[PDB]
Design an enzyme around this catalytic site. Structure first.
Site, PDB file in Angstrom:
ATOM      1  N   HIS A   1      44.215  28.543  95.508  1.00  0.00           N
ATOM      2  CA  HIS A   1      43.716  28.945  96.812  1.00  0.00           C
ATOM      3  C   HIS A   1      42.483  28.155  97.257  1.00  0.00           C
ATOM      4  CE1 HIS A   1      40.119  31.314  95.724  1.00  0.00           C
ATOM      5  NE2 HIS A   1      40.786  31.724  94.658  1.00  0.00           N
TER       6      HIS A   1
ATOM      7  N   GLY B   1      32.253  32.963  94.281  1.00  0.00           N
ATOM      8  CA  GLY B   1      32.111  31.630  93.733  1.00  0.00           C
ATOM      9  C   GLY B   1      32.600  31.466  92.306  1.00  0.00           C
TER      10      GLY B   1
ATOM     11  N   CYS C   1      35.602  31.921  90.937  1.00  0.00           N
ATOM     12  CA  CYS C   1      36.968  31.528  90.651  1.00  0.00           C
ATOM     13  C   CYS C   1      36.996  30.187  89.930  1.00  0.00           C
ATOM     14  CB  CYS C   1      37.785  31.467  91.929  1.00  0.00           C
ATOM     15  SG  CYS C   1      38.279  33.118  92.406  1.00  0.00           S
TER      16      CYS C   1
END
Ligand SMILES: *[C@H](O)[C@H](C[C@@H]1CCNC1=O)NC(=O)[C@H](CC(C)C)NC(=O)OC1CCC(F)(F)CC1
Ligand SMILES: *[C@H](O)[C@H](C[C@@H]1CCNC1=O)NC(=O)[C@H](CC(C)C)NC(=O)OC1CCC(F)(F)CC1
Lengths: 298, 299
Positions: free
Chosen positions: B43, B144, B146
């Site tokens: 993503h 932040g 991920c």
């Protein structure tokens, strides 16, 4: 709702790079290799035979640079001095990957990360809190002496602990890097008794703030116990002097639940939680700092 | 008496050196750099708006090698790009000189692993979690995080097992294995998704009770026994997982002299409460320490 409040440690890579093995005749343990200096506990000089009452000044005298072998798994010794409970070994090669660092002595209530090592190999990391009786908890087995504890302010590493011993109750203590033993314990294999633990008031307050930020604020009433009074109250109830900090205040201004509301709360809550939970607990928690809570629920 | 049974992580140095930052337009998150490959959540390709049902097959085609920036802090040239389930597999033109020996193995519920929480490619913390039977973990992850990764270490071999993707409404988290699958089959769409019912991890609870026995606190052990088969069918109806033995549990039985089936019986009795007694400081059962944890930390 999981608050996301967990026992978090610093990335250990910086410190891993400094861990060495220090050997002296027949003993072996970890040390910390910073620039040209290897730090380790002095009881590496001591054979098993003689651990209950070692004569450290005579041992050191009896020693020479060639008594000490230093090896790195994760080096020739050309100097040796004693500083309190620690050895300061000068080696011919400066550690390249020495990080920016400093030495601090931590005060009860403060958290730091520990890098548990055995035979020079880092095997585990975990966070501890220096209790008011100057012990810590953690996991340390035979061979862990030399393991080190640290905070980070930046990429600056503040080395604060070098592990030395386990008390009869299974808790632990060690030296600060000025060579003094937290809580005045002796580095001798001799029965010694921790003082009675207390609750870290500031850390309890920070935990109740976390609860509020997590939407678990039921325990909050408008009753407000003044600081110095709660202080007086605590001397008699096994609690630490409460000292505010910029970190704590920041928490009040995100929750709008000023401190003294919580000091009062601590009194009514020390009794018992009267059926209810706070962040899944029925006793007060004192191992989360103002700083953990800001950092972790931001 | 303090057990010395605490939440312990692996030293993170091996993994700190593999952490980078991956940027795609406006999205930034962490990536994992092994040899000539950078792994990260897909993503990152998605603009903030299209995130509630994105067409990942078309974002990917719309992308070139120049669509991805990769920076090492703790800049690299992307020379290829591919999608593997919920992750991106980017090729870069420099082999990571600090790649550790490593494997990709998916963990099953009840296994513990270490997490290196990272923001903008910079490692900030490490903690240990347990993959729950609803395929979620707890821990601490913020905006932040991920691409932060979870791993164990057997010998010299890191097993990478998790790459962080999302937080659920109940505050727990999940992500994918490095074969691209999402734990729990959650989707990397920004939509409300409900997790299955949790359960207690029977094998870890046993481990904890062995740990208590080793610490001297054995008041809960009776001769009585409940068999493995018979425990698991009771488990089905009482929110516990199947018990499966391992050599690691067996060492604890051998060392203490207390058989598994005695502790399975104790679990049926302790489930309803301890009736004023504690165990290792707790008044309820702990299921987040593993057999391996107990062998390591008490021996
Ligand atoms: C150094 O690795 C070692 C660390 C201990 C070993 C078990 N857990 C630890 O934390 N320290 C020692 O062996 C010290 C040595 C003296 C000279 C400082 N011995 C020690 O801690 O003595 C304790 C007294 C009470 C006890 F029996 F419960 C355990 C050992
Ligand atoms: C990637 O860095 C991010 C990490 C989240 C943000 C807060 N805590 C975390 O762990 N992941 C996401 O934001 C994902 C993205 C989709 C495309 C998979 N979405 C997400 O976790 O959104 C959550 C839904 C419910 C909520 F508001 F409570 C938290 C955000």
């Amino acid at each position: 709702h999981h608050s996301g409040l967990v026992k978090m440690s610093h990335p250990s890579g910086d410190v891993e790079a400094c861990m060495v093995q220090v050997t002296c005749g027949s003993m072996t343990l970890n040390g910390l290799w910073l620039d040209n200096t290897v730090w380790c506990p002095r009881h590496v000089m001591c054979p098993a035979d003689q651990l209950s009452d070692p004569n450290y000044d005579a041992l050191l005298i009896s020693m020479t640079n060639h008594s000490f072998s230093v090896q790195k798994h994760i080096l020739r010794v050309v100097g040796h001095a004693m500083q309190g409970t620690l050895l300061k070994l000068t080696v011919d090669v400066a550690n390249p990957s020495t990080p920016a660092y400093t030495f601090t002595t931590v005060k009860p209530g403060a958290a730091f990360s520990v890098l548990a090592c055995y035979n020079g190999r880092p095997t585990g990391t975990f966070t501890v809190v220096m209790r008011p009786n100057y012990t810590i908890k953690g996991s340390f087995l035979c061979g862990s002496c030399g393991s080190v504890g640290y905070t980070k302010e930046g990429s600056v590493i503040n080395f604060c602990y070098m592990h030395q011993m386990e008390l009869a109750n299974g808790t632990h203590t060690g030296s600060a890097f000025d060579g003094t033993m937290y809580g005045a314990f002796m580095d001798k294999q001799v029965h010694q008794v921790q003082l009675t633990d207390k609750y870290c008031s500031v850390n309890v307050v920070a935990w109740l703030y976390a609860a509020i930020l997590n939407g678990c604020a039921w325990f909050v009433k408008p009753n407000r116990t003044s600081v110095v009074s709660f202080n007086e109250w605590a001397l008699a109830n096994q609690f630490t002097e409460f000292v505010g900090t910029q970190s704590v205040d920041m928490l009040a201004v995100k929750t709008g639940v000023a401190i003294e509301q919580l000091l009062y709360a601590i009194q009514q809550l020390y009794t018992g939680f009267q059926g209810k939970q706070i962040l899944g607990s029925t006793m007060l928690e004192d191992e989360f700092t103002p700083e953990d809570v800001n950092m972790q629920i931001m």
